[PDB]
Structure formats: C-alpha cells, structure tokens
Amino acid sequence: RPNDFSAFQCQKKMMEVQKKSFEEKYEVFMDVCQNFQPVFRYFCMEKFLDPAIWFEKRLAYTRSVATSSIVGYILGLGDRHVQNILINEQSAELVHIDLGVAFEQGKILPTPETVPFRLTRDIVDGMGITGVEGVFRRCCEKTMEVMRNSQETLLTIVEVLLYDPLFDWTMNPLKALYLQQRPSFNKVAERVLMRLQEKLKGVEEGTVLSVGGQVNLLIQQAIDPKNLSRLFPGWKAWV
Amino acid sequence: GVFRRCCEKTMEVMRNSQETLLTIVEVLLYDPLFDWTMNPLKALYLQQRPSFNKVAERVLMRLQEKLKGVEEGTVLSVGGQVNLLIQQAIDPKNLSRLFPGWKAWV
Amino acid sequence: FSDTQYQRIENYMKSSEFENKQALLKRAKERYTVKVQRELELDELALRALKEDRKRFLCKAVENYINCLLSGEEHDMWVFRLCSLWLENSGVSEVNGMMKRDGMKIPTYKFLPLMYQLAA
Ligand SMILES: [Mg+2]
C-alpha cells in the first residue's frame, strides 16, 4: 500500500493526540485506520504458493492465534505489542515473548491496557476473508471449554506460582514507567486469585456466561475501536 | 414430593426476579430508621439464661449470591440448591448445636 | 440498559482494582517530577470523563424509568429502582428536576409500597 499513510505518519499522528480529549483520540484513530489498511493476509500468500500448503499454514496461524489469545486472557498477559509477538516463517504459528507483564498488571499502567489480548485489524486480516468467524471463534470456544473444565488444577498451579517469594509479578512504579516511556502483597495475591477464579467460572461482570457468550464478549472487547483508541501508541493498535 | 417441588418452584421464581428483589432489599437496607443490624444488647436479650455501609454491602452481596444460586463458590441449579438447603436444615449435627430455646427436638 | 451501564461504572469506581490503581500513583509521587505530575494530571482527566459518563447514564436511566412508569402499570415495582437512584443521588440537580417535572405526573398510588422509605 504505497499510497497509504506511512507507519511513521500514523505513529506521529497518534502521539500528537495523546494529551487531548477521548473524542479527539477516537476520531484521530478512525482517521488513521481509514488511511492504514491491514496487509497481513499477504504473509501466507507470498511464502506458500501451493494452495494446499497455504490453506494449512493459514489454519495453523488462526488456531495459534485463538489458543494464545484464550490462554493469555486466562493468565492476564499484557504488553502484547508488535515487537513482543513473533511469527514462524516455516509454520506461520505465533510465539509470545517478553512475558514479564501478566495477571492484569497492565491494567494498572499509566495508560491502561483495555484489551484482553491483541486482535487488531492485521491479526484478523491474517485469518482470511471470514475473519474471526469460523475457525477462530470455534477454537477459542474449545480452548475456553478446556480451561473451564480444568479450573481446579489451573487455580492450584497459579496459587503455587503467586506465593513464590522469588516471583516478582506485581507492578511497581519503576516498571510501569519503563514500560511506557516518552521523549499488602497477600491482599493483591488474593484479589488476583479471585479474579482468575471468576474468569475460569465464566463470571465477567457479575453475570454467569456460557463459553460462547464469554468468547463473544472477549472478541467484542478486543476488536472495539473505542478500546483501541485509548491504548499507548507503542502498542500500535492501528497495526 | 410436594414440599421439594414447591421449594423448587419458589426458588425458581426467586431466581427469575433477582433484580427486582435486590433493588427492594437495597431500598430497605439503607432506610435510616431500619434497625436491622445485630447489637450486643439485642443478642443477649435473644438468648438469655438463668462501618454500617460495609455490613450493608456484605449483606447485599450475600443476597445476590443466594439469588444467583452460588452457595460455597460453586454455581448450583435450583434443585441442587434446594437439596443443599434441605440437607442443612434436617442435619442432626446442626440441630444439636442450636440454642435450647430454639427447641430443635420439637 | 442505562441502569446497567451506570451500575457498571459505579462498581468500577468502587472496585478494589480502582483503589489499587489510585494508591499506586499516591505511592509513586512520594525528570522524576515531570512524569509524576504527568500521571497525577492524566488521572484527573480519566476521573472527570468517568464521572461525566456516570452522570449521563444515571440521568438517562432515571428519565426512562419515569417515562416507563407514566406509560403503563405492568412494571410498577421498578418504582423501587426509580427511588433507589433518586435517594442515592439527591445532590444531582438533574435528577431532582426530572423528579419535580415529570415525577409529579406519576400516579401517587405507585409510590405507596415504599411509603415508609420515602417518609424516613
Ligand atoms: Mg520487547
């Protein structure tokens, strides 16, 4: 897309509106998204010329995205910017690195992360013409069903994790400032454990939801432009 | 028979109207003239032998859990909740601990 | 739906996560000063937006509850909610004005079931 906005232009426009109203942020984000169209669908096309291999790699990519999204939401993974996610060139599967921020500590950040996972326009465009519908939603539902069926074991494992003395998982002002720079412990652990329990039982806003309903809510929250417009520019929600 | 089925029907109606019931109890609990909390004098008078906002919020959340069928952190159906309540009510172990004025043997 | 949105905002404002986020800034404030004042300035904007959104949702919910009460008798019990929103937000001028203008048109017998709670 040579005639669209450059990534530098989008980044500059996004930083300019940072110290402005939320309406201005939303309108600037919409204008940027108008002149910045996703191109990730070309990743599998240019690498896998054979249609069968192309279809297999695209299916593997979509399944990997669904599984990673559900698991990261369960663990509250944050800081999922473009440089923290890698794609395998041979297998088209996603690998998540830089796992320092987890258990919804990113919501404590100065510019809070309003999305459970990264489901931006490029990520959905990489899934094909159907988008989130089809393979992605069904795989998300399957992963959430498995997570719900194993809530006791998962809760026990996270309990063992959170009380590890050497596990520095809580957010501190120095870490928060380093994450977003521009030119009682028992109480917190119990709160995080109870939030994880609510997630594993399907309770989101005090109402019990089915697996499909919870998946729908997560997808709607992740793809909502209003949430994406509020995010830190380093997250690159337009990409 | 009749008792368990009627209990299930009443619990179903209670669950279907949890929002209205919760609103009504919210209106009740914040009535300034409603002295519903327990105090030591009332407790002693009840059994004699020869922050308010925190308590209100706790009671409201407990009522919400009851109306949603959550008892011990696990979601129960109407039948399961009714079974649990009947088992708790008829348990001799619970009845043996009660105050003699309650007359659990009667 | 407006009441649901308002209740969600209220719960978030009284959530323990909100308290943790607020207390983190108070701990951090105690180069360095520039980012500290940046944070203590942005939190004010966020809180103001949240409060204005809550006020809009509350006003819409109260007005629509009044309109529903004026338009029929099937949902009379919801007057409880109309009182619960009104009594807990007596300081809000818009709610009082709406109760004075259109709340007066509501038939008085619908207020009978909670006549105690109003009288207190
Ligand atoms: Mg990195």
DSSP B18-58: HHHHHHHHHHHHT-TT---S--HHHHHHHS----HHHHHHH
Backbone angles phi, psi at B70, to 5 degrees: -85, 125
User: Chain A partners of C38 at a C-beta cutoff of 8 Å?
Assistant: 110
Kindly give the distance from the C-alpha atom of residue A72 to the centroid of ligand 1, in angstroms, as a whole number. Answer: 16
Partners of A95 in the β-ladder: A86
Taking alpha carbons only, the member of A29, A36, A42 closest to residue A6 is A36
C-alpha C74 chain-centroid distance: 25
Place of tokens 């007005």: C63
Distance between start and end Cα atoms, chain B: 23
Report CB contact under 8 Å: A206, B73.
no
Provide the experimental method for this PDB entry: cryo-EM
Reading phi first (left if > 0) and then psi (alpha if -120 to 50, else beta), residue B38 is in beta
Q: Which of A173, A191, A205 sits opposite C24 (nearest CB)?
A: A173
Q: Which of C81, C116, C120 sits opposite B23 (nearest CB)?
A: C81
Chain C closest CA to A80's CA: distance in Å?
A: 20
Burial class (CB in 10 A: 0-12, 13-18, 19+), A216: middle
Are residues A148 and A215 in contact, defined by beta-carbon separation less than 8 angstroms? no
d(C-alpha A55, C-alpha A65), whole Å: 15
Look up residue B79 and give its two tokens. Answer: 């039948």
Place of tokens 């009851």: B66
Long-range contacts of C56-62 (CB under 8 A, 24+ apart): C57/C2, C57/C3, C57/C5, C57/C6, C57/C9, C58/C2, C58/C6, C58/C85, C58/C89, C58/C92, C58/C95, C59/C92, C59/C94, C59/C95, C59/C98, C60/C2, C61/C2, C61/C3, C61/C6, C61/C85, C62/C86, C62/C95, C62/C98, C62/C99
Taking alpha carbons only, the member of A78, A145, A141 closest to residue A115 is A78
Backbone angles phi, psi at A18, to 5 degrees: -65, -45
